[PDB]
Structures are given as structure tokens and as C-alpha cells.
From a paper:
Vibrio cholerae contains multiple copies of chemotaxis response regulator (VcCheY1–VcCheY4) whose functions are elusive yet. Autophosphorylated CheA then donates phosphate to the response regulator CheY. Phosphorylated CheY interacts with the flagellar motor protein FliM and influence the direction of flagellar rotation from counter clock wise (CCW) to clock wise (CW).
We have solved the structures of VcCheY3 in Ca2+ and Mg2+ bound states to the resolutions of 1.67 Å and 2.2 Å respectively. The location of the Ca2+ (or Mg2+) ion in VcCheY3 is similar to that of Mg2+ ion in StCheY. Although D12 of StCheY is not coordinated to Mg2+, D15 of VcCheY3 that corresponds to D12 of StCheY, coordinates with the metal ion. The average coordination distance between Ca2+ and the protein atoms is about 2.4 Å while this is of about 2.1 Å in case of Mg2+ which is due to the size difference of the ions. D60 is the site of phosphorylation in VcCheY3 as it corresponds to D57 of StCheY. From the crystal structures of Ca2+ and Mg2+ bound VcCheY3 we proposed the presence of a conformational barrier composed of the hydrophobic packing of W61, M88 and V106 and a unique hydrogen bond between T90 and Q97 in VcCheY3.
Author numbering: 5 to 128
Write the structure that this text describes.
Amino acid sequence: ANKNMKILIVDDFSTMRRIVKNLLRDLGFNNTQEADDGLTALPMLKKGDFDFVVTDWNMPGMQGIDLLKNIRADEELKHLPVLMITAEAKREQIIEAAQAGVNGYIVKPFTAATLKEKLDKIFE
Ligand SMILES: [Mg+2]
């Protein structure tokens, strides 16, 4: 239930990456790294032996859902737990992400407490 887990944080707005990185810092996970887009995240996952991915859903290059799909179709990557960050869980979006295989979702603006709750849910 490891706090050394290697985490990738994906999102185009560096200030949001930095909030996420902190939040996870309050919770005991310090092993976090960043990518600014699914285009930049895929090569980091592919070569860097990650355990966990927190991805925004809206990115101009390759969208959250395209990253998730790329991860799930890669035998190497296929086991990764993925939390998606959304500005609003319209159900059509959550449904579609669940189909695509996400482990959970969390609505922004979120908190540490909600982050943990979400972390617990996914990992069972
Ligand atoms: Mg975004």
C-alpha cells in the first residue's frame, strides 16, 4: 500500500501538476514525476517502470482517454492503475472512461482528503 510507489502525473497545466504533486506529498508519496501531455507521458511510462498514473482528462496533444487506451493495449503497461482527473464528471464521460478501463476518477477542484479516499478505492 506503498508510499514509495512511482507515480506519473499528467496534465498540460504545470501549476495543476504541481498541486497534485503536493497533495500526494501530504499523503506520503514523494516519488512523483511529471508529463505535460499523453504524448510526453507514454514514452515515460514505456521506459520508466511506473506503478501509478494520475492523468488529466483534457490535454491538447493526446487526451487522457487516448493515454489510458494506449496504456491498456500495451502488455507492458496494461496493468497500470490510472486515476483520471476531471473538471466535471458528466456521467457520459465517466462511463466512457470506465469502458476504456480507468481505475477511478476524481473531480477537480479536489483535496488531499478526497485524493486519499480515491487512492484507497482504486487499490482494491
Ligand atoms: Mg488539462
